[PDB]
Amino acid sequence: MKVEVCSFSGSKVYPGAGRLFVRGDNKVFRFVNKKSESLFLQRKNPRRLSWTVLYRRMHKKGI
Amino acid sequence: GAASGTKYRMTLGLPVQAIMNCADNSGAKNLYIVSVFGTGARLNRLPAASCGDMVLATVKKGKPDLRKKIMPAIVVRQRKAWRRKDGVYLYFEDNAGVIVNPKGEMKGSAITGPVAKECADLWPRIASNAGTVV
Amino acid sequence: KFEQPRHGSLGFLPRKRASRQRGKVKAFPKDDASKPVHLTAFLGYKAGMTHIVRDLDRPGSKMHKREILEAVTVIETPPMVVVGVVGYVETPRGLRSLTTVWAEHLSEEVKRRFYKNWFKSKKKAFTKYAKKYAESTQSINRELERIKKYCSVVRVLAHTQIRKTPLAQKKAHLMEIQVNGGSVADKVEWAREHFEKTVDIKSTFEQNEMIDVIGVTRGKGNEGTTARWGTKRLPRKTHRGLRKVACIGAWHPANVQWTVARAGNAGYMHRTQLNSKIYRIGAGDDAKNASTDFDATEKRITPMGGFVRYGVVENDFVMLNGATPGPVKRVLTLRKSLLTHTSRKALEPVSLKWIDTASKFGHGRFQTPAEAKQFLGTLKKDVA
RNA sequence: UUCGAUGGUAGGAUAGAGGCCUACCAUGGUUUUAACGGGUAACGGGGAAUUAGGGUUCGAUUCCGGAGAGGGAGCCUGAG
RNA sequence: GUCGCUACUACCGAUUGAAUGGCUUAGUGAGGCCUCUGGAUUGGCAUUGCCGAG
RNA sequence: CAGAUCUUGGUGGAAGUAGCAAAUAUUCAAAUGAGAACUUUGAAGACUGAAGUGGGGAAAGGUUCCAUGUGAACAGCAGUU
RNA sequence: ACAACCAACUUAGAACU
RNA sequence: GUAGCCAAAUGCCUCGUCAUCUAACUAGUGACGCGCAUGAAUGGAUUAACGAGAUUCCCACUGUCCCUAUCUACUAUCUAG
RNA sequence: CCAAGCGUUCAUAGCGACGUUGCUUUUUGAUUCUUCGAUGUCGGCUCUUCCUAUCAUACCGAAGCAGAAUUCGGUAAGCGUUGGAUUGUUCACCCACUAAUAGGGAACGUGAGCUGGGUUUAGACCGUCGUGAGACAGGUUAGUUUUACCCUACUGAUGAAGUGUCGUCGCAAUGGUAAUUCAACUUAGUACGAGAGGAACCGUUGAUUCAGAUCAUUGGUAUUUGCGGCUGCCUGACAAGGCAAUGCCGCGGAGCUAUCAUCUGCCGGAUAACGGCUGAACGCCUCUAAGCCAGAAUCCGUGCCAGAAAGCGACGAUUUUUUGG
RNA sequence: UGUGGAACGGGGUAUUGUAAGCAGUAGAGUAGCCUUGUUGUUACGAUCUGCUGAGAUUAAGCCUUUGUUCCCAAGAUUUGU
């Protein structure tokens, strides 16, 4: 019983949420929803979008 | 095929006439799915296979001695997402398979790329010759 | 040639609209006189569906002692009030009701079932019967004794407390629930003692019990043969449409057979689904309704934002694995199983490890408002 | 001569000259005295066999120089 | 000189010819190296900013 | 005359049924009038978008042109047009 | 041999985003 | 019977024989010809380009299909005429 | 039916000529009884039902150590009988899967269901024949597939009341019905067997086909025109908007939907083949002569769907001081 | 006339992705004037940064509400053991 972290949006992923994508280089990515998965497929960076936790951490949002 | 037991039902993403990459080092690259073992009788339904199945395939690209013949093969990866008993939907970046014999032993020696856990648990030879498992 | 199986089953015929909505018990469990006096059915309302993560206890399985995620259906089951008793004789023409005895006072909820315009009416439903109960106390006993000596089959009349549910309907659902104890005299005495009394869901069903859910499926209106019976779509070249059946019949017999797929009603039908396992009988008076032994969050059985088109469950509820017929907020009938369950899957105890309480109104990712506040920190509407 | 082929200026790199590399400026350099490409069952030489003379053939191999340590590529140590 | 039978030699040839090795085109890219960062840890300075490093 | 897929005329069931769905689109207020979804005025929203749903001609038509009145018939709904 | 403006459309290149 | 052509739009036997192609082809192509009944201006062979001509195959592509599902407008539906 | 026999030897374990008795013919034939004031023509697709002359599944009977295979042998049509290359073709031959890929009828089932690949005779080419117009055991190419709005049938949807009226809760006469098959594993290296070999009652875990539902998750769908972005033009500019018969793109809740997702899918009786019991006659003997047991995916039932709209039961109040009961 | 309904508003829940406006020399650079500049004065400049997890939508088949404003105690037809 463990809650994972989305690879793109960085949000908590409970069991039965999102999907799992295994790339050709043996790297496993967890997407919390289709929006994050589609954006990753579209090659969007999670550090660019303002709603991602990675962006907030890199831009000191919250202090 | 009396290898390690039973496999849970999973979504079929590789019907007949599907071209998939060859993950072993036998010299093939274009495994062309011809038929699937264990397919029942149903009108108009194309026999389709998922990871861990025992499809029949021919080689379209690769070493000439591997072409113009039918050989057993095992699907190790598929692009179509399937869910497990834990409620996790997973899929791979490509559809891949390895040439085997009717007993299930791999014709090659090494497997390139990740392998499905269902296929690895079903076939001990593939699990032995594989590296990263999901 | 090219033989293929039939499209659909000729057992759920006619494919017409159901003549009812509550859903009726077509066969009560066989009565065992040795067992204690108990009810064989209950009524609830479907609130929605959610997740369940549990550890499997099936020896010999690949998923033994492993995590499995299963869909469950939540049915809100507030206590039902018993207001009457019906006795059934055993004539060679079937079961025949002999007489019905009602309680002294019937609530507004059950009394509204007898009216189509409640407010416009004078509400004089059980007036002379109430007067008879108050000032005679002899005819009620006479009828109860008649049910005691005759009427080998005894059923009580119970109505739901729909006012405790977040439903706009004020008309309660009234249903005959069979009593399958023994000593028909004791059955009548039990009914008399339970007159105007509330029977709870935990007194009728228990944990890990296999039951049957009875209800009317979702209405879908008319539908073509392609979706009504699963027939093959005709080719794109087909003139005058393709979502049909090509050959409806042959020559002599010069009639359309009853076994041929035809367009028509494809929903709102009475169905009984067998072998539904009770995963949790939760009470509405505790704050740990949705908590488990492995997840101690103080949360109740309701997604944040409420159940979609239902509301908040504030009463006792029953969680059933899988799906049940009917849309949300429809009244469902829970019936005790007529079979015997000796399989390991049926007898396996179920210990829930985590219950999903995330919003079903979208791609919810938080289980509690406290967790949402912790993740989001403080917002613009929170700083000022 | 593209992605340096010929030359000038300036710079970088090298222990050091140098298109070794970079930016710009000119279209230059070789060749029927065979350039270039291809083959070589070609490591090169001192040398060996035959011996009128002239020549022909061989030379992996005891001496000298070059290359390699299964095929490439990169790097530390160390004057090397 | 044509026609012969045979062992064997060579040529062309549909099969959009196959099978190795150098020379290049396009794509991707292990590895070590140079450089920009990062300061668990060592920390002299209840204290608290400064010399510092792999 | 009961017939001739008879002749002429009238009239039925089908039947208040098939149907009156191409060409993007109408809305508000006022006037008139017995009667306004179709008339007129104003406002709004739109289309044709110069090889036009614009302005003229040849052939053909013959008064359809204009004004004033009418709403019996036609304008397959309506009408004060 | 210089040169104060008016009146013109192209083509090529660079940086940034 | 040529300086030719063919199981050809011309071959009944015939799904002719050999090879290629495919996992599998009575299809297609390349060769053979005692060719029932090919053949030289009743024109024969080859042929670049061209063809809304016929035919075989490959890549890309896709609801043709596995296996159907969802959406929009106009009908069908009901109403006034 | 017959038996000379083959069948190392044993006449019908398996074959069994010559004759003879029959059934069917979906093969073409024979005839011309219906139709020429007109019954649309093959194949394929789709869909339902029926038959057994049984491929598989269920249960029985035989030979040889088992184990397998054969007799499909005996009942049995309940339930299944596939994906492709070729041919318009049916037939037919191959590539595979599968337990198996059985054979037929229904106006050689099925064109106001589709398609038009065959036929398709109007245009055109070739081969043969004819002087010619033209002809064909022939080959090839292009060639309009109309109408239901009537009755009935079928699928669904309303619906009047003489038995009071209006409602609530019920019974079930009758009609329909549903589940199917496979794999692996502890029996175990067990029984059996000189050795080698290798089961099975049963249970467990899964899976195929089918059926009924459902939308917690995942996928799809976009008129949520919800949010954001983009091009051309227009409202003087920003902003905010409009048009481009839904302008385009990304995401997109809700709903719908997916063997693209999830859940669920029993046991009682009577039997067929066949095996037994007491037991005679025919003093022996034998399941049968009377009767009683066991016995199949068979049949009828439990269960599930509908509910006689002219089958029925129980219960509630019986137009309020106008008037009616 | 009621633990009433409706229309709004609030909160929650969801979708999208950081609204307009202001400010900042952050911005590749460009152009004029003089005390002549290790934050130059002046002006323009795709874009970027901070207010801003912002703004917008949120039932139309989401939940909730103690908030505000209205509405209902009506009308017509039929019904007798």
XYZ file of C-alpha atoms in Angstrom, chain C:
384
model
C -22.776 -22.157 -43.372
C -20.067 -20.906 -40.977
C -21.977 -21.706 -37.804
C -22.060 -19.040 -35.090
C -23.864 -18.834 -31.734
C -27.064 -16.903 -31.151
C -27.095 -13.128 -30.678
C -28.636 -12.659 -27.244
C -30.451 -15.012 -24.893
C -34.088 -16.002 -25.397
C -34.642 -16.062 -21.646
C -34.889 -12.331 -21.026
C -37.986 -11.930 -23.179
C -39.939 -9.891 -24.072
C -37.402 -7.064 -24.371
C -40.036 -4.649 -23.049
C -40.095 -2.011 -20.335
C -40.472 -3.401 -16.831
C -43.924 -3.047 -15.277
C -42.279 -1.897 -12.029
C -39.376 0.157 -10.708
C -38.854 -1.062 -7.127
C -37.901 -4.596 -8.150
C -39.654 -7.606 -6.640
C -38.418 -10.866 -5.134
C -39.623 -13.632 -7.450
C -38.512 -16.414 -5.078
C -37.722 -16.225 -1.371
C -35.223 -18.642 0.211
C -36.502 -22.015 1.370
C -37.688 -21.808 4.968
C -35.736 -23.703 7.641
C -37.738 -23.935 10.866
C -34.660 -24.663 13.002
C -33.014 -21.328 12.189
C -33.877 -18.250 14.280
C -36.505 -15.807 13.070
C -34.995 -13.429 10.515
C -35.798 -11.420 7.399
C -34.831 -12.528 3.895
C -34.657 -9.174 2.097
C -33.833 -5.490 2.439
C -34.199 -2.297 0.415
C -31.484 0.251 -0.305
C -30.595 3.050 -2.698
C -27.581 3.026 -5.007
C -25.260 5.914 -4.140
C -22.411 5.254 -6.568
C -19.228 3.279 -7.119
C -15.654 3.532 -5.853
C -12.378 1.611 -5.555
C -11.191 -1.089 -3.166
C -7.631 -2.299 -2.560
C -7.344 -5.547 -0.609
C -4.923 -8.404 -0.008
C -6.018 -11.629 -1.684
C -6.377 -14.721 0.502
C -6.680 -17.343 -2.252
C -4.171 -20.214 -1.914
C -2.801 -21.543 -5.180
C -3.348 -18.220 -6.973
C -0.658 -16.060 -8.547
C -2.076 -13.038 -6.688
C -2.157 -14.807 -3.312
C -1.070 -12.454 -0.512
C -0.878 -9.637 -3.071
C -2.651 -6.339 -3.675
C -5.741 -6.399 -5.904
C -7.926 -3.462 -6.945
C -11.650 -4.103 -7.405
C -14.633 -1.910 -8.205
C -17.376 -1.785 -5.578
C -20.909 -0.382 -5.508
C -22.178 1.612 -2.519
C -25.819 1.094 -1.520
C -27.182 3.313 1.250
C -29.395 1.153 3.487
C -31.080 3.127 6.278
C -33.171 1.046 8.699
C -36.562 -0.071 7.401
C -39.722 0.389 9.465
C -42.042 -2.610 9.803
C -45.690 -1.536 9.608
C -47.617 -4.688 8.706
C -47.802 -8.462 8.460
C -49.233 -10.644 5.681
C -50.109 -14.338 5.981
C -50.077 -16.707 3.005
C -52.132 -19.907 2.814
C -50.901 -22.783 0.648
C -53.841 -23.531 -1.649
C -53.455 -26.050 -4.512
C -53.611 -22.988 -6.781
C -50.523 -21.395 -5.201
C -49.836 -19.148 -2.246
C -52.871 -17.024 -1.372
C -52.877 -14.091 1.030
C -55.474 -14.616 3.758
C -55.402 -11.322 5.678
C -53.165 -8.334 6.374
C -52.600 -6.744 9.789
C -51.189 -3.217 9.973
C -49.598 -1.182 12.743
C -51.471 1.345 14.872
C -49.798 4.392 13.297
C -48.352 4.675 9.789
C -45.831 7.415 9.074
C -46.274 10.049 6.383
C -43.576 8.367 4.280
C -45.413 5.051 3.928
C -48.829 6.734 3.704
C -47.696 8.742 0.665
C -47.251 5.450 -1.215
C -51.050 5.062 -1.247
C -51.629 8.441 -2.944
C -50.849 10.046 -6.288
C -51.694 13.589 -5.082
C -50.725 13.657 -1.408
C -51.032 17.390 -0.719
C -54.347 17.758 -2.561
C -55.768 14.790 -0.628
C -57.267 14.833 2.866
C -54.643 12.292 4.051
C -57.367 10.000 5.433
C -55.580 6.764 4.555
C -55.417 4.703 7.771
C -58.154 6.482 9.711
C -60.775 3.854 10.570
C -58.056 1.208 10.931
C -56.282 3.421 13.472
C -59.592 3.913 15.291
C -60.136 0.144 15.311
C -56.635 -0.489 16.669
C -57.071 2.162 19.366
C -60.546 1.289 20.662
C -60.942 -2.449 19.933
C -57.614 -4.311 20.473
C -59.573 -7.494 19.677
C -59.873 -7.774 15.889
C -56.114 -7.258 15.511
C -55.500 -10.192 17.854
C -58.112 -12.283 16.029
C -56.440 -11.682 12.664
C -52.979 -12.357 14.108
C -54.200 -15.667 15.540
C -55.716 -16.519 12.151
C -52.295 -15.959 10.571
C -50.868 -18.069 13.406
C -52.963 -21.185 12.748
C -53.280 -20.830 8.960
C -50.811 -19.027 6.653
C -47.809 -21.344 6.533
C -45.931 -18.458 4.852
C -45.566 -15.202 6.803
C -44.257 -11.937 5.341
C -43.965 -8.557 7.041
C -44.569 -5.179 5.414
C -41.589 -2.826 5.657
C -41.090 0.652 4.209
C -37.850 2.534 3.625
C -36.943 5.735 5.457
C -36.395 7.759 2.301
C -36.560 11.002 4.305
C -33.129 10.180 5.774
C -31.699 9.947 2.206
C -30.655 13.011 0.128
C -33.419 12.313 -2.404
C -36.143 14.724 -3.491
C -38.751 11.943 -3.395
C -40.791 11.810 -0.185
C -42.781 8.688 -1.147
C -41.298 5.725 0.710
C -40.965 2.289 -0.883
C -43.115 -0.435 0.686
C -42.248 -4.101 0.236
C -43.237 -7.511 1.588
C -40.217 -9.163 3.234
C -40.504 -12.857 4.061
C -39.582 -14.135 7.522
C -37.639 -17.399 7.296
C -37.345 -18.523 10.896
C -39.663 -21.201 12.238
C -42.784 -21.662 14.347
C -45.273 -19.617 12.292
C -46.713 -18.504 15.633
C -43.276 -17.104 16.535
C -43.066 -15.412 13.123
C -46.354 -13.621 13.818
C -45.192 -12.705 17.324
C -41.923 -11.361 15.913
C -43.863 -9.257 13.399
C -46.186 -7.949 16.124
C -43.240 -7.038 18.360
C -41.520 -5.285 15.436
C -44.615 -3.279 14.465
C -43.609 0.388 14.089
C -40.009 -0.689 14.788
C -36.909 -0.201 12.649
C -34.880 -3.200 11.470
C -31.265 -2.425 10.579
C -29.144 -3.738 7.724
C -26.602 -5.409 10.022
C -29.409 -7.453 11.607
C -30.405 -8.813 8.169
C -27.025 -9.305 6.457
C -23.491 -9.896 7.717
C -19.920 -9.488 6.503
C -18.690 -11.558 3.530
C -22.248 -12.719 2.825
C -23.219 -13.620 -0.740
C -26.540 -12.023 -1.694
C -28.579 -11.204 -4.795
C -29.338 -7.670 -5.991
C -32.713 -7.082 -7.659
C -33.537 -3.932 -9.594
C -34.561 -2.368 -12.883
C -31.732 -1.533 -15.274
C -31.087 1.860 -16.842
C -33.564 3.016 -19.455
C -32.189 3.392 -22.969
C -35.264 3.821 -25.165
C -35.527 2.245 -28.588
C -32.410 0.760 -30.157
C -31.496 -0.946 -33.400
C -30.574 -4.603 -33.670
C -26.851 -3.770 -33.740
C -26.834 -2.484 -30.151
C -29.958 -4.248 -28.842
C -28.808 -7.776 -29.733
C -25.173 -7.392 -30.814
C -25.705 -8.203 -34.489
C -22.958 -7.570 -37.027
C -22.902 -4.210 -38.786
C -23.727 -4.442 -42.479
C -21.127 -3.275 -45.029
C -20.681 0.376 -45.942
C -22.045 -0.364 -49.432
C -25.416 -1.350 -47.936
C -28.291 0.651 -49.392
C -31.016 1.993 -47.084
C -28.908 1.562 -43.959
C -26.532 -0.907 -42.331
C -27.386 -0.928 -38.599
C -29.975 -3.664 -39.172
C -30.329 -7.412 -39.696
C -30.119 -8.455 -43.340
C -32.311 -11.582 -43.348
C -35.229 -11.325 -40.932
C -36.689 -14.626 -42.119
C -36.892 -17.249 -44.819
C -39.882 -18.433 -46.855
C -42.408 -20.945 -45.414
C -42.847 -20.594 -42.439
C -44.232 -17.409 -44.010
C -43.937 -15.382 -40.803
C -41.293 -13.489 -38.860
C -40.008 -15.777 -36.120
C -39.906 -14.713 -32.476
C -36.185 -15.602 -32.357
C -35.097 -12.929 -34.865
C -33.472 -9.727 -33.633
C -35.680 -6.656 -34.072
C -35.411 -3.001 -33.112
C -37.190 -1.900 -29.959
C -36.773 -1.236 -26.258
C -33.271 -1.997 -24.977
C -33.311 -0.820 -21.349
C -35.324 -0.403 -18.152
C -35.731 -4.104 -17.414
C -36.115 -6.169 -14.254
C -32.954 -8.156 -13.506
C -31.690 -10.261 -10.603
C -27.907 -10.544 -10.297
C -26.593 -13.502 -8.309
C -23.555 -13.845 -6.043
C -22.787 -10.314 -4.882
C -20.350 -10.338 -1.962
C -20.730 -7.866 0.901
C -17.373 -6.143 1.361
C -18.420 -3.808 4.194
C -21.527 -3.062 6.271
C -20.726 0.464 7.416
C -22.673 2.376 10.044
C -23.598 6.016 9.613
C -22.844 7.038 13.209
C -19.037 6.677 13.107
C -16.471 8.986 11.520
C -14.276 6.052 10.386
C -16.757 4.664 7.845
C -14.243 4.479 4.981
C -11.177 3.799 7.136
C -9.420 0.435 7.297
C -7.030 -1.317 9.660
C -4.154 -0.369 7.321
C -5.353 3.201 6.620
C -6.390 5.104 9.751
C -7.610 8.339 8.148
C -10.797 9.639 9.786
C -12.969 9.720 6.672
C -16.501 8.569 5.899
C -17.883 6.785 2.826
C -18.368 9.772 0.526
C -16.118 11.259 -2.173
C -15.176 14.882 -1.661
C -17.703 17.000 -3.505
C -20.358 14.355 -2.853
C -21.579 11.365 -4.807
C -22.352 12.316 -8.399
C -26.090 13.110 -8.640
C -26.735 11.436 -5.261
C -25.310 13.487 -2.385
C -23.732 12.482 0.934
C -24.372 9.107 2.573
C -25.233 9.779 6.228
C -26.852 6.412 7.057
C -25.823 2.764 7.142
C -24.505 1.458 3.829
C -23.526 -1.844 2.223
C -20.536 -2.141 -0.114
C -20.866 -4.801 -2.824
C -18.128 -6.002 -5.151
C -18.771 -5.436 -8.835
C -21.758 -3.649 -10.320
C -25.507 -3.760 -9.723
C -28.364 -3.080 -12.155
C -29.918 0.357 -12.289
C -28.715 3.957 -12.304
C -27.668 6.032 -9.315
C -30.280 6.761 -6.595
C -32.502 3.898 -7.811
C -33.980 1.671 -5.110
C -32.388 -1.787 -5.039
C -33.590 -5.030 -3.461
C -31.024 -7.112 -1.569
C -32.108 -10.748 -1.254
C -30.469 -13.615 0.611
C -28.925 -16.194 -1.700
C -30.971 -19.283 -2.551
C -27.832 -21.377 -3.164
C -25.088 -22.821 -0.955
C -21.621 -21.248 -1.117
C -18.813 -23.748 -0.529
C -16.258 -22.388 -3.013
C -13.097 -20.779 -1.669
C -13.837 -17.528 -3.515
C -17.247 -17.279 -1.839
C -15.973 -18.320 1.606
C -12.839 -16.144 1.536
C -12.976 -13.400 4.196
C -12.486 -9.901 2.791
C -10.298 -7.401 4.660
C -10.295 -3.999 2.972
C -6.987 -2.128 3.088
C -7.883 1.190 1.431
C -11.106 2.845 0.254
C -11.047 5.510 -2.452
C -12.719 8.775 -1.433
C -11.377 10.968 -4.237
C -13.870 12.996 -6.242
C -15.795 11.080 -8.899
C -16.620 14.418 -10.572
C -13.317 14.316 -12.454
C -9.719 13.158 -12.178
C -9.643 13.702 -8.439
C -6.304 13.133 -6.734
C -7.008 13.966 -3.064
C -8.788 11.700 -0.586
C -9.630 14.287 2.097
C -9.932 18.088 2.200
C -7.131 18.062 4.782
C -4.855 16.298 2.291
C -5.850 18.795 -0.408
C -5.009 21.698 1.910
C -1.668 20.113 2.831
C -0.667 19.645 -0.815
C -1.895 23.021 -2.082
C -0.614 24.988 0.911
C -2.422 28.324 1.032
C -4.339 29.822 -1.897
C -5.440 33.327 -2.854
C -8.856 32.735 -1.281
C -7.056 31.510 1.866
C -4.455 34.253 2.407
C -7.207 36.890 2.503
